[PDB]
Write a protein that binds this DNA or RNA. Sequence first.
DNA 1: TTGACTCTCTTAAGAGAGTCA
DNA 2: TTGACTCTCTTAAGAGAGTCA
Lengths: 162, 162
Amino acid sequence: ALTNAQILAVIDSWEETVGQFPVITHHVPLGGGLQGTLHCYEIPLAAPYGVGFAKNGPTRWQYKRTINQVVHRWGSHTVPFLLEPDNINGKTCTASQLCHNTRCHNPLHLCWESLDDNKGRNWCPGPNGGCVHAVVCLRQGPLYGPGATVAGPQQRGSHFVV
Amino acid sequence: ALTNAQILAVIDSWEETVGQFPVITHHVPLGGGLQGTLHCYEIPLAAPYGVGFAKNGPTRWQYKRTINQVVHRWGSHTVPFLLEPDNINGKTCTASQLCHNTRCHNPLHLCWESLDDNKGRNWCPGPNGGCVHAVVCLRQGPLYGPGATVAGPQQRGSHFVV
DNA sequence: TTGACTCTCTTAAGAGAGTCA
DNA sequence: TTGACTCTCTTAAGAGAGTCA
Ligand SMILES: [Mg+2]
Ligand SMILES: [Mg+2]
Ligand SMILES: [Zn+2]
Ligand SMILES: [Zn+2]
Ligand SMILES: [Zn+2]
Ligand SMILES: [Zn+2]
């Protein structure tokens, strides 16, 4: 529908509005015991959120723009990638939040990849702890670590061998 | 079912039956460019699956036992952990399959942990690649890798900073 | 053309429970 | 009692679309 020039305008207006969001400084683990800093542009907790934004879920938002009387809407974190392929290896591309802070809409904190790749970053050791992602992580995953396993592999008899 | 003796009975009969499932060898990446061998006891693809087992989904099964005329039924992979706490830090404990082979029911390939710890193993580098899970992984997660990102963080203008 | 809500869907790791014979 | 199916739910990363003034 929209021309590439029109999509650019949509991206530009998106950046301009998100850019005025409260910018919050966050200190985060980078892995290897190092500490870093991230600056998230956070969408408000309740309405109003900003021109073109509306909440469709607890931590889900959409961006709306009307062009030539026809309404267009996109996931709030997807706008930055409107000109990129929308799938790879037969998998749908998703906005992968590098800062692991949902309300953040800083485009420098997002990448475009499959859901499996997206999820995996929750456990990455970080850019300074051994991250191997081609598009490097910005910080260590919130869920990385020893874990909290209640019980490990076990058997009562001798019917099994590893 | 309810008493200690009864639960141990459920576990013992479960191991007995599963102990007769065909044993299939699988060679897997351990990380660090090394490779290992696992022995999975795989439940059949079609009925009959074995005494007490029934398929409730493509890759989901349930174990069923009648104790004192009352029918009890659990998730096929949960039986080994019947005596363990069913939650940790307020999170439901789940049968975490270390061998990443759903049909396998070898208790030596299972642990009891949060769904989050469970999922995270898909991206673990492995026992020889830097795994830090308290209850060590048996192999490198199938999803570990550089990923396939279509587009990284980017901005059109100059309103943002990392 | 817009803002503020509403509701249901996707994935892939995991589950509970009913209908028949 | 035991076997073989059927249908829906949970979680936490992510989505599309309708109503109304
Ligand atoms: Mg993410
Ligand atoms: Mg698993
Ligand atoms: Zn951020
Ligand atoms: Zn990473
Ligand atoms: Zn196995
Ligand atoms: Zn591990």
